[PDB]
Every structure is written in structure tokens, then in C-alpha cells.
């Protein structure tokens, strides 16, 4: 029903309980409160209503001072309908922010306090200060700087001399000025002419905005390198721009025992299990082993068989074949609990032997265990898995161990000082190393590289990864030698650094070298790898790491990176294994991004209403047919709390797009399995793209779809980087939540299934009549090539009329990438007769056109091949994501073969042709 009885606690101790409307905003509720309180005792002692602030317990279980009283009670969403009057005074800037953060990131900040963990608290102290300083620095600096922070330039790659017209206007002015400029005019030069026309009917006091978007035209670059202009040129449409004064941007801007002495074999005491749920006839074993990355430091020792029961007791020393001095910094003890007869992995847990301050841990630890999933690998242990405890401490299984007291004083892993102290002291051969490096190594080969490890540094600087693996990390002397080399190792290119971020290289010093080499990344490039970098955080041991700082440095310098950093982290907060890590990064981000918080807040509530809107539609689909369901959607949308929330937000898919006025009539849903929603906005000031759409899908995971699109966008950038525009449609796709995301709609488009009801060729004729049709066919040909190559390389199957889609421009594109890397064997290259028909303009034989198209496909495949190591590296890091079809070396193997990296360039290009040709053959039958 509409109204709800709310409990009011006045600060005199008096108590009122009356009904108010869920719609009513807080300000309105105060007035009703004050009107009712006047007839209760102690009213004369209350100050005025504006002296006080409502307080509630919100959904995240924390108190919240409700400073914005324009908010509806249904929006505030208190836990129980209970409001306390307290006093305004206090540092309520810190109170407000802290509250909004808890609501925003999903997790309540108190949950971090509750843990009573130094590491957590230390992380929070350092990162929040660091972010806050960055933010305070940003405020002082110039508006130009601020514009660069907030609306970084969106440029076309290569990051041609014709000339066409352009409409420019001023802020708060109906009239506008159409005039000629060239492709190669810089943007300040353009501002000169409109500013001259102003005095008819001061150049650097302004910049240019793209009407109805937060995209801005500035800097030393020519017009045609900007996306909007480039887009306008290709469509033929005139640009539409606004001049905006510095003031207007400023207004936006405002609102002691050395470790190597302990030559004693490593040992732990296994005490008890807890909350174990195993088959009562079987009997329990705990297998345990030390690891450094992938590699066993020693032989894995095991427990005795105790009887299966909920609370099994062992009280067993497990000694290991390694002395305490030999342990490396990132040494990692790993447990697995099994059930055995007289086969079953129950659960596992991992533990860093040293802590975040470099201290060798001592005494009891209670490792709350994770359940084991049965899988292809089925290894003894799971040393790749996270080192954090399971957050379900109440109901999860657990293991009580004890790390013994090893020396009277505490002990740390030696400082960089003494590593260099130890590491200092220590053409026939060159031919063998050449052969081994220049071309999982073997016993024989590993031993050679280690001897010639200095020559590797001198002459094979790119082979650092090869050398790290060949180091014996279970002996401290070796470790000192490698690290010594590492500190004087030359900066490697980005491509090599990405390899080093993989799980195989857990040493803190290696990660530092990696990030050191990624600091040369431009924001445009960093953005291509943001997803991968985020997943790599799941490999980290400690919270405070070079990667977290790096990502925070870039998020704070660039608001677009900050945005996607936010959503990448936010969309996994439901996942227990990363909630804590991610939560802490999100808090730090927010604190240095109060401007963007306001935007991200609005988006999360759009998202929260859409979830509820989809859940209604789903639950109504069962009851009623579609047309009536379509209108019952519209009524729920037209509710003030919904409509306000769904209207006037920056798009999560691209923050420069303003979703302004929702068009309830044009909204709908598809009756597929997950019943996705189609939401249409008509934003003012935009022209041909004065309509924009978003799909809200809930119930499926969208990550594999995004990875695939990210990868296609990357190809498009690699191709565009050598003068080949293949007319792709790299539409936006963003996971925002638990099996929830958004997908950018591509208007003026239909599925081949529908178009086929010269079938394709006529549709294009009716969309490109007369002398247009030539363009549509070329748009089709360029894109067919791109999606033919892309889908062959990524190995995307299950292609059909229902999931290939055509634009009225001619451009073809794929949707709904369910499967890839040849998951339900090698996917052949694929030409449809339908697409060969269109490419040939309807002829049986059009040899001249068809060869251009073969060239396009060959140029495509060649370029990707030049950057094949980039795709392997990016894919290798994505194994962190735990996508079922991207779990192992074989899924990466597919890519090597698909790009034929093991073959020479011309050899590979001959295999492409034979694959190509048999697809041409196979197309008829």
C-alpha cells in the first residue's frame, strides 16, 4: 500500500508513531512531524525544525545523517521505518561522504572496521590520504587541467585534406553561425571565427562542446582526429557545437635477528577442523604444500586419517623439506581437506607465511576454507587461489593451525639493503642460449640460462620472464642473485610488462618492475587493458600493492578511467573472494572523486530501479500476455520516484552521453529467457543521435560478451592504426552488478533473420536508394571482412541469423558472443553465400570486388598477427576472471594456432588462403 507508519524519536526522549507516504520527501516529513509533535509533551524545549537532521539505519546496517531532505523516503530506504532527530553540528562533510560511499560500493564501511585487521586499516589510512591529496591538488589547478581530467579528448586512432561546413553557437543563445573550415584546422583556429562573428552580428577564454554531450574539442590536434568530426564527415552530417567560457567550466569544477640465520626445517602444527560436512563412512585427510606462484617449493607432506566428523582433531606436526631461511618473500602455504576411503577434495585454503609488514607469521591462525570445485586439472592443492579467508565465517568450514615460535625476537624478510649485499658477489655458450631464448623449458635448458643469467640481462633483456621461472625460489642464495639482476634490469616495453603481471611471477619486486614499465602507457592505451589489469588484482597477496596504487593514480588523473575502474570493481562486489579487496579500492577511489561520486550515485539508482522494473516484467510475463505487460511496465515507469531516477543521468556505458528524457512509449522488453529491457531516451541538443538506447539485461553473466567486444574494439584500433577502417560497430557493454549489465543499442538496425522475411540486397536497396547503394555495399564489405576475421581468430561459434545484425548504413555486426576459442574443436573460417552475394553486388561472378574483399580479410589477419603476443598476454591475464571457456593453457593455445604464431609470416598467410578458399567452396553447399 501507499503510506507506512514511521517511528519518530525526538531528542527530548519523546516518541511518535504516525503514517506518512512512501513518496514523501524528508523535508515534507519534518513538517508533518512538527505538526504532530506540538500536541505531545516537551515541544516547547525543541529548537526549530531546521536545527535538526533525520537519522536512520540504512540497508547496509549503518547510521546515516540524512542531510539531503529533498529525498523521498522510498529512496532513502531505511531498514526499519525509524527516524531520530539529532543535531546538525559536526564535521558532516566527512559524515555525508562516508555514508554515500557505503551505499555506493554495496558494502558498508563498518564491515571493514569489524575485521580488526591492521592491514585493512593501514590500507584505508594510506590510500584514503593519498586519494584525498590528489583530489585537493586537482581543485587548485587550472580549468584547462580540469577539463583534461574531466573530459579527456576522444580521438580517432593514428593518435586526407578535404573541407566541409560546421555549425557553432554560444551558451544561452538561440542564434548560431554556420561556416566553412577544413579537416586539418586546429580547434583554437575555429574558435577565432565564431568569436569574430560575435563582434560582427579573447580566443583562449573558451573551448568547444559537442551539443548535448560532455565531449569537448581542445588541444593541439586537427579537427578530423576527433571522433565527433570524423563521425560527422563519414555520415555527411554537419557538426553542432557550443562555445563555453572558462567561468562556465570553473562553475562545473566547483559544483632484530637476521632471517638467514634460522637453518631449521619449516613446520606447522595442525590442530582441529571445524564445520566439516563430509560422508560419515569415509575418513578425513589434510594435504598441505608450500608454493611460490605455480611452483612447489618442496615435497608436499600429508596428515593421518582421522574419522569423518564435524570437528576433527589432528594435533600433528607437519615438517617440510625446506629450512626457514630458504623461504622467499611471497612464500605461500596451501591446504586442501580431503575425504578418503578406508578421491574427494572437500575444501582448500592458502596462507601467506609472511605478512604485509614483511614479518614471518607466528602463532595460531584460523583459515576459513573455500569449497573445492571438481575440474579437469583436479590438482592436489589450489595454490593459484586467493590468500584471503572466506567471509562466511559463521557457516563455512575452517582449520586451526599454529606457526611455531622460531626465535625470541620477531623476524622479517631481509631489506633490499642486504639482498644487494648477497646478490653482488657472483661464443660457444652464446649459440646455445640464442637457440633456447630466440625462437615451460626443460631441466637441461633451465640450468644453462641460470649460468648465463648475466648475459641474459646484457643481451636478451626481453627474456626476463624466461629467467625468472628458471630461478630456484626454494633457495635464498639464488633469490638474492636474481633480484640483484632485477634491480639493474633495463625498462621493458609494455608488451613484456603485461606478461610479468601473470600469476607465474608473484614476487613483489617483479610486479614493481612490471608497473614501472606500464607507467609509459597513455590513457587511451591503458584503457584497452583496464579489464585485464583489474582481474590481475585477484592474484595479489597483500591489499596495498603497486598495481592498486597504479590503478588509483590513473583513476585520479583521468575521470573516464576512474569511471570504468569503478564499474569493473563494483560489478564484482557480490563475489565473496574479492568483496573486501575491491571494496577498499572503491572507497579510496570515491574519496578522491567526489564530483564523479555524484554521477555514479545517480547511475546506481537508475540501475536499482531497472532491476526492480525487470523483476516486475518477469513476474508479469507469467501472468499476462505481452501488450498488457508492456503497458504495466509503462505505469511503473511513470511513477515519480522511478521516472526521476531513470531520467537525467550520464550513461554508464559512456559518461559523455547524457540520457536525459526517458521515452516511456518507446521503451519495451524482449521475451527471451532473461527478459531484457529496452529503454529509449530523447536527449535535447543532440541531432541524428538525439535518440539513444540502453538494454538492461539481468539473469545472465555479461563478462564473456564484454571481453569479446573489448577484443573486437582492440582489433579495430590495431587496424585503424594502419589506415584500415573496417567499419566495425564496437558497441558498449558493461557489467554493473551480479548477473546484471547494460548494452548500448545500435539503432537503425535489424537481425538477418528478420531481414530474410537478393533478400539482404533488397533491404539495403530500400535503405540506400539510388546512388547511395554503392556506399552501403562498401560498408557491408569492409565490415564482413572484419567480423569474418575477428570471429575466426577468437574462434567464435554458434553464429546464425538471430545473432548477426545489419545496419541501414550497410554495416554488418555480431551480437551475443556466447562461446569462443572453439567452445561448443577448431571453428573454420566462414563465408555465407548471402554475404558473398551482397559483396558481389548481386552478380554470380564479380571477380574485381571479391578480390578487394579477400585483400581486406588478408590485410586484417596480417595486422592482428603483428600484435599476436598482445592477445596472448591479455588472454593469459583473463584466466584470473574464472570464465569457464577461458580457464587454461589450451584456451590460449587456440589463439596461437588461429594466428599461426608458430609459423612464419608467409607460411601462415598461405594457410589463411586455404582456410579462406575452402570457406568459399563450402559456402555453396
Amino acid at each position: 500500500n501507499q503510506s507506512v507508519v514511521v517511528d519518530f524519536l525526538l531528542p527530548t526522549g519523546v516518541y511518535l508513531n504516525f503514517p506518512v507516504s512512501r513518496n514523501a520527501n524528508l523535508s515534507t516529513i519534518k513538517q508533518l512531524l512538527w505538526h504532530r509533535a506540538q500536541y505531545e509533551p516537551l515541544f516547547h524545549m525543541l529548537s526549530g525544525p531546521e536545527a535538526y537532521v533525520f537519522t536512520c539505519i540504512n540497508q547496509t546496517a549503518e547510521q546515516q545523517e540524512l542531510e539531503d531532505e529533498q529525498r523521498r523516503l522510498c529512496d532513502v530506504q531505511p531498514f526499519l521505518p525509524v527516524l531520530r532527530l539529532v543535531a546538525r553540528e559536526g564535521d558532516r562533510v566527512k559524515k555525508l561522504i562516508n555514508s554515500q560511499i557505503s551505499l555506493l560500493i554495496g558494502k558498508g564501511l563498518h564491515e571493514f572496521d569489524s575485521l580488526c585487521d591492521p592491514e585493512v586499516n593501514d590500507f584505508r589510512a594510506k590510500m584514503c590520504q593519498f586519494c584525498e591529496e590528489a583530489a585537493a591538488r586537482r581543485q587548485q589547478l587550472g580549468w584547462e587541467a580540469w577539463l583534461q581530467y574531466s573530459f579527456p579528448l576522444q580521438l580517432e586512432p593514428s593518435a586526407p585534406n578535404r573541407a566541409l561546413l560546421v555549425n557553432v553557437k554560444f551558451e544561452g543563445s538561440e542564434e548560431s553561425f554556420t561556416f566553412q573550415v577544413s579537416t586539418k584546422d586546429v580547434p583554437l583556429a575555429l574558435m577565432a571565427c565564431a568569436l569574430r562573428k560575435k563582434a560582427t552580428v579573447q580566443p583562449e577564454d573558451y573551448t568547444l562542446q559537442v551539443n548535448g554531450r560532455h565531449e569537448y574539442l581542445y588541444g593541439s590536434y586537427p579537427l578530423c582526429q576527433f571522433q565527433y568530426i570524423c563521425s560527422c564527415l563519414h555520415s555527411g552530417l554537419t557538426p553542432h557545437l557550443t562555445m563555453v567560457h572558462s567561468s562556465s567550466i570553473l562553475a562545473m569544477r566547483d559544483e632484530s635477528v637476521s632471517l638467514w640465520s634460522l637453518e631449521q626445517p619449516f613446520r606447522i602444527e595442525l590442530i582441529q577442523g571445524s564445520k566439516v560436512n563430509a560422508d560419515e563412512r569415509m575418513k578425513l585427510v589434510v594435504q598441505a604444500g608450500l608454493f611460490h606462484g605455480n611452483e612447489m617449493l618442496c615435497k608436499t607432506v600429508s596428515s593421518s586419517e582421522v574419522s569423518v566428523c564435524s570437528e576433527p582433531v589432528w594435533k600433528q606436526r607437519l615438517e617440510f623439506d625446506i629450512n626457514i631461511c630458504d623461504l622467499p618473500r611471497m612464500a605461500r602455504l596451501c591446504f586442501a581437506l580431503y575425504a578418503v576411503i578406508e578421491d574427494c577434495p572437500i575444501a582448500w585454503a592458502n596462507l601467506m607465511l609472511f605478512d604485509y609488514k614483511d614479518q614471518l607469521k607466528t602463532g595460531e591462525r584460523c583459515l576459513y576454507m573455500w569449497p573445492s570445485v571438481p575440474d579437469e586439472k583436479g590438482e592436489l592443492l589450489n595454490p593459484t587461489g586467493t590468500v584471503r579467508s572466506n567471509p562466511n565465517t559463521d557457516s563455512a568450514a575452517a582449520l586451526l593451525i599454529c606457526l611455531p615460535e622460531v626465535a625470541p625476537h620477531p623476524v622479517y624478510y631481509p631489506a633490499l639493503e642486504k639482498i644487494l649485499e648477497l646478490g653482488r658477489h657472483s661464443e660457444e655458450e652464446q649459440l646455445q642460449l640464442r637457440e633456447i631464448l630466440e625462437r615451460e623449458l626443460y631441466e637441461h635448458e633451465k640450468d644453462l640460462v641460470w649460468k648465463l643469467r648475466h648475459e641474459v640481462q646484457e643481451h636478451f633483456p626481453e627474456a626476463l620472464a624466461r629467467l625468472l621461472l628458471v630461478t630456484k625460489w626454494n633457495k635464498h642464495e639464488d633469490v638474492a642473485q636474481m633480484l640483484y639482476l632485477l634491480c639493474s634490469w633495463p625498462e621493458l616495453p609494455v608488451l613484456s610488462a603485461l606478461e610479468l603481471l601473470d600469476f607465474s611471477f608473484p614476487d613483489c619486486h617483479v610486479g614493481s618492475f612490471a608497473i614501472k614499465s606500464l607507467r609509459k602507457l597513455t590513457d587511451d592505451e591503458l584503457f584497452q587493458y583496464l579489464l585485464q589489469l583489474v582481474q590481475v588484482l585477484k592474484y595479489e597477496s597483500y591489499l596495498d600493492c603497486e598495481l592498486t596504487k597504479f590503478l588509483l593514480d590513473r583513476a585520479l588523473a583521468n575521470r573516464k578511467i576512474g569511471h570504468f575502474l569503478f564499474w569493473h570493481l563494483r560489478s564484482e562486489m557480490h563475489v565473496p573472494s574479492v568483496a573486501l579487496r575491491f571494496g577498499l579500492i572503491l572507497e579510496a577511489y570515491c574519496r578522491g572523486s567526489t564530483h564523479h561520486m555524484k554521477v555514479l550515485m545517480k547511475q546506481g539508482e537508475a540501475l536499482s530501479k531497472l532491476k526492480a522494473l525487470n523483476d516486475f516484467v518477469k513476474l508479469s510475463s507469467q501472468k499476462t500476455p505481452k501488450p498488457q505487460t508492456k503497458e504495466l511496465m509503462h505505469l511503473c515507469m511513470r511513477q515519480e520516484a522511478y521516472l526521476e531516477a531513470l531520467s537525467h543521468l550520464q550513461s554508464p556505458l559512456d559518461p559523455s552521453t547524457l540520457l536525459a528524457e526517458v521515452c516511456v512509449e518507446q521503451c519495451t522488453f524482449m521475451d527471451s529467457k532473461m527478459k531484457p529491457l529496452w529503454i529509449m531516451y530523447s536527449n535535447e541538443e543532440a541531432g541524428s543521435g538525439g535518440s539513444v538506447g540502453i538494454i538492461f539485461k539481468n539473469g545472465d553473466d555479461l563478462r564473456q560478451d564484454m571481453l569479446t567486444l573489448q577484443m573486437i574494439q582492440l582489433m579495430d584500433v590495431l587496424w585503424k592504426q594502419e589506415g584500415l577502417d573496417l567499419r566495425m560497430t564496437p558497441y558498449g557493454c558493461l557489467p554493473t552488478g551480479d548477473r546484471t549489465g547494460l548494452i548500448e543499442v545500435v539503432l537503425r538496425s535489424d537481425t538477418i533473420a528478420n531481414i530474410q522475411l537478393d533478400a539482404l540486397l533488397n533491404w539495403l536497396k530500400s535503405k540506400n536508394p539510388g546512388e547511395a547503394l554503392d556506399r552501403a555495399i562498401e560498408e557491408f564489405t569492409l565490415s564482413c571482412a572484419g567480423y569474418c576475421v575477428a570471429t575466426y581468430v577468437l574462434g567464435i561459434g554458434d553464429r546464425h541469423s538471430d545473432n548477426i545484425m545489419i545496419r541501414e548504413s550497410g554495416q554488418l555486426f555480431h551480437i551475443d558472443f556466447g562461446h569462443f576459442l572453439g567452445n561448443f574443436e577448431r571453428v573454420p573460417f566462414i563465408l555465407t553465400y548471402d554475404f558473398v552475394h551482397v559483396i558481389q553486388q548481386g552478380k554470380t561472378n564479380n571477380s574485381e570486388k571479391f578480390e578487394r574483399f579477400r585483400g581486406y580479410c588478408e590485410r586484417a589477419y596480417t595486422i592482428l598477427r603483428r600484435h599476436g603476443l598482445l592477445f596472448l598476454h591479455l588472454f593469459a591475464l583473463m584466466r584470473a576472471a574464472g570464465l569457464p571457456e577461458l580457464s587454461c593453457s589450451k584456451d590460449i593455445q587456440y589463439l596461437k594456432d588461429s594466428l599461426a604464431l608458430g609459423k612464419t609470416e608467409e607460411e601462415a598467410l598461405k594457410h589463411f588462403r586455404v582456410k579462406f578458399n575452402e570457406a568459399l567452396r563450402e559456402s555453396w553447399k
Binding site: 526522549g13 519523546v14 531498514f79 560436512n277 560422508d279 574427494c344 557457516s395 565473496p576
Partner: protein, 153 residues
């Protein structure tokens, strides 16, 4: 021991594996869902703690603010108002108590889901291995990929 006989057994064993996998997958959904619900319950219980703290600070204030005041028929209104306050706390205590009881019941479900998973894992792992042993046996015997495909599923 003949090829058709082993290939028939590879079909059966594959069907038993895919179905056993489907069962575990269904249980693992329940395990995850139950884990999200219980976290939700444990934090709604925190939300009950925090509310009740708010009501007991109110009670503290009602006594301190009233005692110092009440020396100066208003008395009867104040005291009944306090009795009405105290009465509402007992509703909120009762409701908290009901949730605690659900979380206890759902903890027992979580417990049982995880136990049912841990007795399937041996069957599931044994069926993967057997399936694979029959696959390799036939691949060694020279059996063509077409024939292996049609036995699987």
C-alpha cells in the same frame, strides 16, 4: 572388449557424467544463492542491533532528560509516552529474534547443501576419469573421430 561394446559403455558413462555434472551444477547454484541470502541475513541482523541501540539511547535520554525536568499531569503524558516507546522496542526485539531463527534454519540448509555436494564429488570425479579412460582406449585402438563424437552425448 570389442570396439562397439567399449563404445557403448563410453556412451552410457558420458551420459552418467553429464547428468551428474548437471546435478552438482544445480546444487552449486543453491550453495551460492544460500551464501548470498545468509550474508544478507547476518547484515539485516546487524541492522536490527543498530536500530535497537538507537532505541536504547532514546531510553537513556528519556530517563536523564525526564528526571532533571519532572519536579515542575504532564507527568502522566511523559510516562505513558515512555511506556509506548518501551512497548515498540519489544516488537523490534521480537522481529530480530524471528530473523535469528531463520538464519539458524538457513545455516542448517547451507550445511546440508555442502554435505550433499561432498558426496557427489567422488561419483563425478570417478565418472570423468572412466569416461576419459574409455576415450583414450578407443583413440589407441584407432577409432575414428566421427565415431567417438556420436558416442559422446
Amino acid at each position: 572388449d570389442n570396439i562397439e561394446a567399449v563404445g557403448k559403455k563410453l556412451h552410457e558413462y558420458n551420459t552418467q557424467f553429464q547428468e551428474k555434472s548437471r546435478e552438482y551444477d544445480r546444487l552449486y547454484e543453491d550453495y551460492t544463492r544460500t551464501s548470498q541470502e545468509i550474508q544478507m541475513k547476518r547484515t539485516a541482523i546487524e541492522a536490527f542491533n543498530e536500530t535497537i541501540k538507537i532505541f536504547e539511547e532514546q531510553c537513556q535520554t528519556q530517563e536523564r532528560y525526564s528526571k532533571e525536568y519532572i519536579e515542575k499531569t504532564e507527568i502522566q503524558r511523559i510516562m505513558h509516552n515512555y511506556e509506548k516507546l518501551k512497548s515498540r522496542i519489544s516488537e523490534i526485539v521480537d522481529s530480530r529474534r524471528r530473523l535469528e531463527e531463520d538464519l539458524k534454519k538457513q545455516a542448517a540448509e547451507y550445511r546440508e547443501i555442502d554435505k550433499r555436494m561432498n558426496s557427489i564429488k567422488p561419483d563425478l570425479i570417478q565418472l570423468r576419469k572412466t569416461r576419459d579412460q574409455y576415450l583414450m582406449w578407443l583413440t589407441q585402438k584407432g577409432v575414428r573421430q566421427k565415431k567417438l563424437n556420436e558416442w559422446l552425448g
